Structure formats: structure tokens, C-alpha cells
Amino acid sequence: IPRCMEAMKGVRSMLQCMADTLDFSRLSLVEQHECLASILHAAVQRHHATIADFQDFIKILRKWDKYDHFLIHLIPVLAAYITEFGSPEGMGDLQQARRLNDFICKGGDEDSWALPVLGAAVRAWWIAEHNGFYLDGINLDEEDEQRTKQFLDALKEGAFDFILSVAADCKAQEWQDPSQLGARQWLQRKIPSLPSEPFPFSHFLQHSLMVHLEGFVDATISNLPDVLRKLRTEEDEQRQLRPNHEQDMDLERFLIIISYAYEGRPDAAMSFWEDPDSNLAGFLQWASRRASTPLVSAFCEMLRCLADNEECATAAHNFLLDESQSLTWSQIFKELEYFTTKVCSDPAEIEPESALMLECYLRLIAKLATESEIARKRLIMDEDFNLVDTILKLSVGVIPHRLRACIFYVLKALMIRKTHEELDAMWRWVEAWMTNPFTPGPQECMEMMFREFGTGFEQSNAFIQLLTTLLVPPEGLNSLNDSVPFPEWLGSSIRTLGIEPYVDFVFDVFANRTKDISDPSQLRILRLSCLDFVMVCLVTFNEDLIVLGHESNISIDDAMAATNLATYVRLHPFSRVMEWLFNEKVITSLINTIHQDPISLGSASPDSPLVVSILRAIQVMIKALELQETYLHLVRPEVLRYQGEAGVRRKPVANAAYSAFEDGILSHLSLVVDLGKYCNLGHAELTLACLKLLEKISTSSRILSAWSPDGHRNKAIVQLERNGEGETISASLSASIMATLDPALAASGENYRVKLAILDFLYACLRATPDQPTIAHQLLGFHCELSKLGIEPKGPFDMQKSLFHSLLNVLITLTVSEEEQGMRGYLVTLKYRVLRILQLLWKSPLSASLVMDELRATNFLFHMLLREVQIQPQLPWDGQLVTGCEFLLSDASLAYIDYLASRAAIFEYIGKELCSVSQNRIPSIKRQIFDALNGQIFVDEEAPLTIPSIFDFFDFINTDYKWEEIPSPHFTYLKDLDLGPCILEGVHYDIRKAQEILALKRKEYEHSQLATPEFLETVELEEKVLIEWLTVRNRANLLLTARLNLLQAWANLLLVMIESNDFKSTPKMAFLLQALQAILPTLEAFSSLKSDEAFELARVAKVLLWKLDFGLDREQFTVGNLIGDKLFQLFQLCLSAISQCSGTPELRSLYYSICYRYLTAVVDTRSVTNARARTLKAITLYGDRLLNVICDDAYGSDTTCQTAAMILLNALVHTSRASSPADVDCPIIDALNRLNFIGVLVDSLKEILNEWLASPSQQYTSAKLALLLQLCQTRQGAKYVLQANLFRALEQSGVFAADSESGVPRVVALERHYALLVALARVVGAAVTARGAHNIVQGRKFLTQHRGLVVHVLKKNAGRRDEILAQQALEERIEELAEAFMLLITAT
Ligand SMILES: [Os+3]
Ligand SMILES: [Os+3]
Ligand SMILES: [Os+3]
Ligand SMILES: [Os+3]
Ligand SMILES: [Os+3]
């Protein structure tokens, strides 16, 4: 203990020696002194404190001179010592409890306390705590006489004025609740006010005090009743003989001690209402009997604090019913009616004590009316009481401002909760009350009312809080606000403007009359009440309802509770409240509300009006921008068209120069800066509003079109460098995304929620205008100049201190798995929100250079792979498992989605990182990457780390899940419920609008009451089951889009890995076999189902097969033997896939390239002729079906398909002949003639010069003529070719008939032309030779009909960019043609 005392002694001596970095020190130490007190108090409560420490502690109090904050810290420790050694509850010997009675009470034993009032408080406590011990002897009658004497003298010495001063100075909320201004603050105070220091008191220290003050209050009431009943008669009768001296008001101060004690704590206040026979409940009966006007107030200040709970408040309400009279409602309402006549004629004036008594009455009314429903339902409609009329009449007459406020808080307390009936009734009182006093004029009287109520802080803040509550719907805010938030008839008698007269007042206060206010704490609370009003008006506007009625099948009034959709837009304040936000003064008030001292804001409380006045000002700017598009388009033209029909008009408050809310905050450059500096203050809900406003500011075409153009380069960017905060707020965001997270608080934590709000800001800012440097670039640490990034040396980025690196750092530390508790879905979403930023930052040309550079230095590709987990069946997400009864319903679904998107973003980087390496960067990286993709990582070298293989990360597909085979609601079934929110391209949905429609049919049937109540509950379920069905189909559709997107990343990853790394060695030859081992079970499984995924898998198989370009070890053979095994069952599935024609031409074009190479390179000593036989009989096993597909593909719109189809046929005929001298009988050629392919083939030769005019259509025809030649080699082939009139097609073409920017030298264009003739000449040659003399007449007619051309060609052959080579590559084509005609003539 004495160490604790000496520790506190050192703090006070430091703090007093320091007053004779500076402010935060006092803040730091004062709190440390406040903790040691709470810890010492705990120690005394444990019976380990000793009688010795008590004698020393009392000595410190007897010496203590200055009444300060340090003294208050020791009050709970004092009452702990007293309750220990003094009370019987404490285990203190009676002789020892008597022993210290003299040490405290006797006086004249060093009892010249440096603070005489303090010693009076110490003495009063022990007596109250010790007299109860003598309950259950020596000198009882004398002791009690001694007790009451030294107790009464202590009260006059200033005891209760000290205990009350501590209770009042202690629980000092640094913001002034206007509803309880001046309450309990009218009693005289001989105590000197605490010094000017801003030293607060812990939210706990206040509580610990009010616990001991309950023990003090409980002690005096239970142990010293007669002392209180000696004080009732002393001052009550002395009030009549000596009314002027202000006789001892200690009993009043005692009731305020009770008020401060039980305030906020209804658990303790129940001891006053639990047992009516207890001393505490008997006390309320006792104090309420008589009504000394100041003593009544002190009693009502006690009840207001004895009703913080609905249970305590209901009891207090019953206490004033009485159903020797106590104080009752009957008595209160009589005086409320007795003084309303002393004003609305006494002359118009009231006594201060009488006026105060009324305030304590209207304050008790409000409190009991808000906390208890019974009290509200009673007071609001009782005739013997008649509350509404008297308080409304009292407000007409001349009264003090504070009293007129308390009336408005009573009306608010009556409207804090309400029905649609009590709202119309209240508005009938308010209408008449505002229309006339009850000529001065009906509406001109309404002007006088607002000018009064908005005159001072006390009323204006109070009256606006009443107008705020009147617009909160009966069903509760955030309901279906389909009805107007007030009666349509309101004002239709006179002004016809509904609420607008009240709106134009709230903005008149907020924009013009806030300037009359001077106290900053009052200016905040007023602006907070004004902004709370604007919010209530913008939220109750159902914009989803307006777009629906203006766009699709829904009723204007048959459906909604309002009498019309046009009436809804007219009467609702949204029409007018929006117009006000376009006003220059209102906006300049919104900025100056936000603009505040940062250190004063950061050193404040998160609940103080200083913080919330800024939070609420932001919330208005956000909500303004959200509801702006609906306003300017669907709302404003409806008002300017109705006020032209009705002819009515009111003053325009908006600015015609403002075409959008942006135009107002364009000029206020201080706004974007202040929004950042407030994140550095450590107030969460304030931060989230600031960041979400930076999005809508830095994601709007206007404000991003006013920072760049002026000369100025970028205004908002340099504005962060103006005072030098651009780096200090960027440093704060770093500590925010580095901050710790609590698994218990989980998805809704201050740290976690601030992270997502930053990652949503940096992304939302980058996604817009991604090719120009934005705010998000500068805050990330990139040095931002025009259209160019860069790192400033000795800057937070170059030294790896930037925020950007903190996004990497948080990534390489996440553990999104809690050992079979599942992948916490809130945490995998954190990973995605970070990655998608980095993704945008390696796709844009600005960042890819700087980012891919820094991602290399940091080993980013490795840390992600080191932490990536394998997808598995029994791998739960959020505790939920895939393939559950309904997995696509919980927030675990969207967590699996985000994980697939996160994986794809990793493969995409590993791909780009595997291309930036191949060009030059040493094989140390490609080796590291490649082994990291097989699972061999050597960071520390002690041993190689085992990471799952890139083929184990092929875990994002199991073809049996059938996500696409869960049904969608039939579009007519939705249309019959008039649901037209469905989005297309499969079908997607808008859950929100759809659920909005179902809520409007619910109120349509609920209010109509035609069929109820059970049918309602069944419909209430089917709606919840429909939107439950819709959410599954749009999340499944959202999963397939994310799974396919991932397949392209894993697929495209293997491609970049095949082409960079050459495969000739066994360990590599073993890798590609491992790859082929993983894609085949999948591609084989659903090459029939659908194409989109089969295309990506069939594409890695192609590129793979074309990489085995073809002295060995005994292991490499067993490898290749397993590759030839897989390549066969690949060739098989490609054959079955083609024969079915299951995929699009672009996919089968990929199938034909796989078969072509398997027939070209693989199959082509006698073990190869066997391979030809097996491969051949496998093709022709499918009959003409397989050939039909390849044939009609050779004549399709797809140019790449018909080329691969024609080339595949060329290889099919080639391998059947190698299987079967040169004239034989082929089954394939006989099939083609049957399918009429050779017919349409020869007939497609007419436009040979049109198609042949390196060109894509050039190579397709080159494959066509290579096939014709293949056919004409055999006898039957040359027959089927010629039987289709071959020579006829060669004549109608006219190719045998002796250049505008086509990008080749001319010399190469001719050899292509000749090469066409080279092919055509060989085709005719093979045809004449194979058939026989049957076409020697045709072979003769062919030359006689084209003679001369042969003569020129037969003589042309006889006789350095590329020209020498081109002439060689041409003159040889003439040597081939001269030989083509030479072998034709001699064979003819
Ligand atoms: Os429609
Ligand atoms: Os004006
Ligand atoms: Os289940
Ligand atoms: Os590339
Ligand atoms: Os959704």
C-alpha cells in the first residue's frame, strides 16, 4: 500500500513542479493517478488494508489543502476505508470501529483540517456508517445525542455542499445536454470551483463514486432517520420566520446527492420501488408529502434520476397517481394551470423559484414520458390532467427561454414513440397553435412563431428537436416509408405547403441564426440538431419507390399507403430539403461545421457534439450525393410542373448556378484535406464517414474535373502537400491497416471496419480514371506528377515504409484458417479487398513498372504461395461447408467467391512475374518460381519448405457440383408478382428492388385486411423464401463467373510456364506429365457438358502437346511411357468430343490441332505400323458421324476452324494409307465421297483466285489443295475427284490465264501465285496418272486448251533484304512448274 501512496505522491509533486508535450503529459499522469486510486480502492475492498494505512491515509486528508481533481480521486478510497473499519459490513472490530470514532470525530486532535469543509464531510460519513452498527450496551442515549450533535454541526460546516460538489464536479460530461440545463445547479455553492485545467474523469471513476454515494445515502436514511426529520422542521418553519436569509438548504442538497447517485443506474433505483415498506420507499413517501417550492424542485430532480429504466419510470408514474397527500400528477397539473394564467392574462412575470419549479416539473414529465410507455399513453390523453393544452397555452405567454424549451422537450417526449393516430392529433394542436395565438392574420402569425422559437440557443435547439421527432414514422425509422411522414391535410387549409414552412425554418436557423450563437459548445449542439433534421428528411424518402413507379409495372396509389405517387413527391420534405442543400449559405455551414481544430477534435470524446456534429455534417453530404441523381431527374421536374399547375410559388433558395451538389463543394478545397486529418484522430464512426465521402468526392466526374483543369497540375494532390499532411495521414492509414483484430469482435470491429473502408476508398478512387494519378496514388506513397508515377528517394516508399507496403505486409501475414473452425469469411474478404487494389496496380501502364519492381524485391509471389491453403471437401468456411443443404445462403458463400477471386489475382501476378523474369533476369527467380510451383522453397536452407503444388491448387473445380443445374424461378412466375428487377446476361437479379416489391404487396394486403391474419404469415414466409431462392441463383451465377475467371488464371499460368521453360529433362518431363495428369480427368469429364471451361483446359493440352518437340535413363523412359498413355486417352476424348459436336467451332478448332499433331509427330520398327493400325481403327470406329463434323467445319464462318478442319482431314487420309503399292482402297476417302465432301471440295475450287488474292484465307486453301493432291494419289481418290468435274472447276476459275499496299515485296507475291499453280499442276498430274488412259483425252485437252502458258513457263526456267533469296525461291517454283508440265506431257 505505502508504495501506492508514495507513487501518487510523486505524480502530484511532478505535476506541480512542472507548472512552475506539456498538455499530453498532464493528460497522461492525471489518468495514471486516477488508476492507482481505483486500484487502491480495490485493495481496501479486500480486507488486506491495515489499521496503520488508515491512520496515515486520514493524515493525508487532514493535511490536504487544495480542492482539486486529485482530491476527488480519493473519495471512493475514503468511503472504502470507512465502510471497512466503520461499518458492520466491513470486518472491523467494534472496539476498533469505536477506536477511530475519536480519531475522526472528537475534534481538536490535529483536527484543524487544512480544509475544514473536507473534515466535515469525513465526520458525516463515519457517523452515518457507524450509527447502524449500534442497532444490534453502554451509553446509547448519550451516544445518539452526541452523534446528532457533531453531525448537525458538520452539515452547517458544509458537509452536504461538499459531497454534492464532488458528485457534481466529478460526473462532468464536458458537453451540455440542453434538455437538463440548469437542473440541480441552483443551490448555493460555498465550494470553490475546480481550476481551469481540462482534466477529465474516467467513465468508470464516476461510477465507483456513485456506488459509495448510494452507501452514504442508504446509510443516513436507514441509520439516521430522526436527523432528517429534525431538518425537515428546522428549515421549513425557519422559512416562515426568516424567509430572506436562505435558511440551510442541506436537505435539498441531500436529494441532489441521491439524484447524482442513482442516475443512469436503474438496478440501484429499484430499491426505491421494490418494497413499499422498506426505509427507502418510505423515504419517497416522506419527502413528497409537503411542497416547499424550492424543496419540491429538489425532489423532482431526484425522481428524474430515479427513472432511467422503463421499470423504474413506470413506478415513478404510479407514484404520482396515488390510486397527507404526496406529490401527484393532480397537484403538478394544477400548478401548471395556475401559472399559465399569471402570464396569459398576475402581470406577465413569474418568481424564479416558482419558474424553476415548473422547469423541474416539465423535466420530470419528459423523462417519465420517454422511458415509460404507460406514462406517455396516460399523460398524452388524460382530461383531468389535460397536458397538451396547458403547456401549449403557457408557451404563448411571456416566459423565460429555458422554460419554453422544457415545454418543447415535453412535446418531444410525447412523440418519441407514437401511432398514426396520435401523430395526426398532435399535428392538429401544432397547426392551430402555429396558426394563431387565440386580426393579426393566420399565416402572418406563423412567421412570428418561428422568429421567436429560433431566437436563442435554448429554444431553437429544443424546438428543432421537436420537429425532428415529429417526422420519425410511427412504425419506426428505417421502415417502409411509403406514406408521407405527416398528414397530407397539414396546412392544406392555409399555407398548402405541408412541412416546407417548418423546413425553411430549420435551414434559416442552420445557415443564418447559428451566427448569433457564440459559445462553441452551444454552436455544435445546434448544428447537430439541424443536421439530425436534414437526415430524418432524406432517409424517409423511398427513392426505390419513385424509380419503380416511374419505370415499371407498379401502381401509383393502389399499392402504397399514400394517396398518390405524385402526392408523395409533392408533400415529402425531400423536395424542399434537397433544394436547400444547393444553397450557398447551407453548404458554407456544412463546411464550417466540419472544419474544426484537429487537436481539440482528437482530444475530445467520440460521443461529444464536437465529433458528432462533424460526423452528421458528413452524413448529410454523403446522403445528398446519393439521392442527387433521383432529385434532379425524377423529383425536381415534378415540383416545377405542379407549382405551375396549382399556381402556388415559394421563394427559390437553391442556386441556379449550381447544376449539381458538387458545384458547391468544388470551391472548398479545405474539405478534402480535413476529411483525411480526421482519420488521424482515432474516432471510428467518424473515419468511416470521412472515407466514404472521399470516395463520392473522388469518384464523381465533376470534382475530379475541377482539381486538374486550370497552370495548376492537380489541385487536390498539391493540397495534401500544402501544410505537409499528405505524408502524416498516409502514415496513419498505415497503422490502421496494420492494427490488430480481435477474433471475438470479428466482422464488426472498429479496426476491421476501418480497414475495409480504406480498401474500399483506395479501390473506388483508383477504378475511376485509372490512367491518371489520383488521390489514392499519392496516399499510397507514389510521387504523383502529371501522367507519371515515381518514388521520391529517402521517401516512405523507397525505404519500404509507404502505405502501399503495408498492404503487402498485411497480406504476407494473414492466416485465414482457424484449425477446422473454418476459413473466417470476414478475413478472406480482407485479403480480396487488398489484392484487387494491387491487381489494378499492375494492369495500368502507370504502376506496373514501379509495382512489379517492388513486388519483386519483397518476394511477394512467395509469401502468398507460402500461406495459400488447399481447397478441400471438409474445409469449412465460417464453420459452413460446401454441398450443405443450402451453402449459397450464408456469408460463407461470398467468402468462397472472394477466395477464388483472390487466387486468380495471384496466378495473374505469377504470370506477369514469370514474363518479366524470362527476358533477362537470372534463372534464380524462374527456378525459385518453378520449384515454388512444385513446392520446394529454400528460404533458411536448414530444410526445403513443402508448399502445395500448382497441381494441388487445381482445387477450384469438381465437375460434380452442378452449380448450373439449380433452377431459376420461371420469368412468368416472377412477372405475375410484378417483379421486373431481373438482370440478364445467365439470369441475374437485383435482390434489393425485388424485396422492395414484396414489401409493398405486404402492406397492400396487410392494411387492406381483406384476408388475414394467418394467410399473411404464410405469404410473409413465401416472400422470405422467394428472395431466398433468388439469392441462391445470383450467387451461383456469381460463383461460376469467378470460377471461370480463375481457370483462365491457372490455365494462362501454365502456358506462360510452358513457353518460358524448355522441356527436355526428366524433372521437367515429369512436371508436364503431372500437369497432363490433372487437366485430363476434368477435360475428359465434361468435354460434352459445356465449352467455356473446356476451352481453357483444351488450350493447355494443345500448347503442351506442341512442346514435346521430340541416350536416356531408365527413369525418363517410364516417364515418357506414362505421357504417351495420357496423350492417348486425350486423343480418344478429343475424338468423342468432335463426333458429338458438343462445343463451339472455336473449341473444336482446338480439338483438330490436338489430333493433327498426334497423327503427325507421335504415330509417325514395325511397332509404328501397329500404332498406325490402332490409331486408324479408332478414328473410323465412329463411322461417318466423326467425319460429318470435320467436313462441314471445313466450310464454316469460322476461318480458324475450317483451316484446322481441312488440315486434320489431310492427316487422316495420310495415316490410313501408311496403314494400308500407291493405288489402294481407303475407307476414309470412300466416306468423304459419300458425305459429298469431295463434291463440294472440287466445286469450291472455282473461286480459287478469289480466295487466293501468308493471308489467312491463303493457308486454308493451301491446306485444301494439299488434300486434293492427297486424294488423287490413289486410284479411287483420283476417280471421286474427277467424277465431280475437276477440269470444269479449273476452267470456270480461270487461274490459268497467263498489288495495292499488300505488305510484301512483289517478288514474294509471285512465288505464292506460282506455288498455287505448283499445287494445281500436281493435282491434275496425279489425277491423270492414277486413273489411266480414261482421262489422257482430258489430260490432252487440258494442255491444248492452255497451250502457250506452258510454252512460256517451259522457256522461262531455261532462258540484299530478301531479293537474292526471293528470286531463288521463285525461279525454283518455275523449275517445279516446268517439271510439273514435263511429267504431265510425258505421262499423257
Ligand atoms: Os416491365
Ligand atoms: Os436567403
Ligand atoms: Os443443412
Ligand atoms: Os506475357
Ligand atoms: Os446479392
C-alpha span between 661 and 1065 (Å, rounded):
67
What are the boundaries of each domain within the chain?
1-192+199-245, 264-417, 425-656, 669-740+749-811, 963-1039, 1062-1219, 1221-1388
One-character DSSP codes across 596-610: --HHHHHTS-TTSHH
For residue 990, the CA-to-ligand 1 centroid distance in Å is 14
For residue 984, the CA-to-ligand 5 centroid distance in Å is 14
C-alpha span between 1272 and 51 (Å, rounded):
123
Contact present, 445 and 431 (Cβ < 8 Å): no
* 739, three cell numbers: 492494427
For residue 834, the CA-to-ligand 4 centroid distance in Å is 24
C-alpha span between 815 and 827 (Å, rounded):
8
For residue 886, the CA-to-ligand 3 centroid distance in Å is 6
Which whole-number Å values give the CA distances from 822 to 560, 816, 869, 882, 904, in the listed order? 45, 8, 12, 11, 21
The ligand placed nearest to the CA atom of residue 885 is 3
The ligand placed nearest to the CA atom of residue 910 is 4
For residue 1020, the CA-to-ligand 1 centroid distance in Å is 24
Compute φ and ψ for 342, nearest 5 degrees.
Answer: -65, -5
172 φ/ψ sector (left φ>0, alpha ψ -120 to 50, else beta): beta
The ligand placed nearest to the CA atom of residue 913 is 4
CB-neighbour burial class of residue 1053 (10 A; exposed 0-12, middle 13-18, buried 19+): buried
For residue 532, the CA-to-ligand 2 centroid distance in Å is 21
CA dihedral 20, 26, 31, 37 (to 10 degrees): 0
For residue 878, the CA-to-ligand 4 centroid distance in Å is 37
What are the beta bridge partners of residue 788? 785
Q: Which of 173, 207, 185, 154 is nearest to 253 (CA)?
A: 185
Peptide bond into 1013 cis (omega under 30): yes
What are the beta bridge partners of residue 983? 988
For residue 553, the CA-to-ligand 1 centroid distance in Å is 6
Give SS3 for 788. strand
The ligand placed nearest to the CA atom of residue 655 is 2
* 522, three cell numbers: 452551444
Q: What angle do CA 269, 275, 277 make, to 5 degrees?
A: 125
C-alpha span between 1033 and 1018 (Å, rounded):
23
The ligand placed nearest to the CA atom of residue 1052 is 4
C-alpha span between 405 and 789 (Å, rounded):
58
Contacts of 76 (CB under 8 A, 6+ apart): 37, 38, 41, 205, 208, 209, 211, 212
Contact present, 1035 and 893 (Cβ < 8 Å): yes
For residue 1054, the CA-to-ligand 4 centroid distance in Å is 12
Give SS3 for 950. coil
Give SS3 for 1270. helix
- Resolution for this PDB entry, in angstroms: 3.2
Q: Which helix (H) or strand (E) holds 762?
A: helix 750-767
CB-neighbour burial class of residue 1285 (10 A; exposed 0-12, middle 13-18, buried 19+): middle
CB-neighbour burial class of residue 1001 (10 A; exposed 0-12, middle 13-18, buried 19+): middle
CB-neighbour burial class of residue 65 (10 A; exposed 0-12, middle 13-18, buried 19+): exposed
* 840, three cell numbers: 489494378
For residue 991, the CA-to-ligand 5 centroid distance in Å is 6
Give SS3 for 877. strand
CA dihedral 766, 771, 773, 774 (to 10 degrees): -30
CA atoms within 13 A on the CB side of 930: 22
For residue 531, the CA-to-ligand 3 centroid distance in Å is 47
Compute φ and ψ for 788, nearest 5 degrees.
Answer: -165, 125
For residue 980, the CA-to-ligand 1 centroid distance in Å is 5
In three-state form (DSSP H/G/I as H, E/B as E, the rest C), the secondary structure along 273-342 is CCCCCCHHHHHHHHHCCCCCHHHHHHHHHHHHCCCCCHHHHHHHHHHCCCCCCCCCHHHHHHHHHHHCCC
The ligand placed nearest to the CA atom of residue 988 is 5
Q: What angle do CA 407, 413, 418 make, to 5 degrees?
A: 130
CB-neighbour burial class of residue 427 (10 A; exposed 0-12, middle 13-18, buried 19+): middle
For residue 975, the CA-to-ligand 1 centroid distance in Å is 8
For residue 513, the CA-to-ligand 2 centroid distance in Å is 12
C-alpha span between 1213 and 1191 (Å, rounded):
13
The ligand placed nearest to the CA atom of residue 884 is 3
Contact present, 415 and 423 (Cβ < 8 Å): yes
For residue 606, the CA-to-ligand 1 centroid distance in Å is 48
For residue 915, the CA-to-ligand 4 centroid distance in Å is 5
Contact present, 753 and 688 (Cβ < 8 Å): yes
C-alpha span between 144 and 293 (Å, rounded):
32
* 1301, three cell numbers: 499496299
C-alpha span between 895 and 444 (Å, rounded):
61
For residue 1053, the CA-to-ligand 4 centroid distance in Å is 10
Contact present, 569 and 639 (Cβ < 8 Å): yes
The ligand placed nearest to the CA atom of residue 881 is 3
C-alpha span between 720 and 781 (Å, rounded):
12
For residue 1018, the CA-to-ligand 3 centroid distance in Å is 22
CB-neighbour burial class of residue 428 (10 A; exposed 0-12, middle 13-18, buried 19+): middle
For residue 999, the CA-to-ligand 5 centroid distance in Å is 18
Q: How was this structure determined?
A: X-ray
What are the beta bridge partners of residue 476? none
C-alpha span between 737 and 733 (Å, rounded):
6
Compute φ and ψ for 936, nearest 5 degrees.
Answer: -125, 105
One-character DSSP codes across 1184-1217: HHHHHHHHHHTTSS-HHHHHHHHHHHHHHHHHHH
For residue 653, the CA-to-ligand 2 centroid distance in Å is 6
Contacts of 356 (CB under 8 A, 6+ apart): 182, 186, 294, 297
Grid cell 440542453 in the structure block, residue: 178
For residue 558, the CA-to-ligand 1 centroid distance in Å is 18
C-alpha span between 299 and 184 (Å, rounded):
10
For residue 903, the CA-to-ligand 4 centroid distance in Å is 19
The ligand placed nearest to the CA atom of residue 981 is 1
For residue 1032, the CA-to-ligand 3 centroid distance in Å is 14
72 φ/ψ sector (left φ>0, alpha ψ -120 to 50, else beta): alpha
Compute φ and ψ for 455, nearest 5 degrees.
Answer: -85, -40
For residue 913, the CA-to-ligand 4 centroid distance in Å is 9
For residue 1030, the CA-to-ligand 3 centroid distance in Å is 18
Which string of b and e fits 674-698 if b means at least 16 CB within 10 Å? bbbbbbbbebbbbbbbbbbbbbbbb
Question: Which own/partner contact pairs does 786-795 have at CB distance under 8 Å and 24+ positions apart?
Answer: 786/713, 786/714, 787/846, 788/846, 789/846, 789/847, 789/849, 789/850, 790/850, 791/850
Contact present, 806 and 738 (Cβ < 8 Å): yes
C-alpha span between 608 and 1363 (Å, rounded):
87
C-alpha span between 425 and 353 (Å, rounded):
34
For residue 823, the CA-to-ligand 5 centroid distance in Å is 21
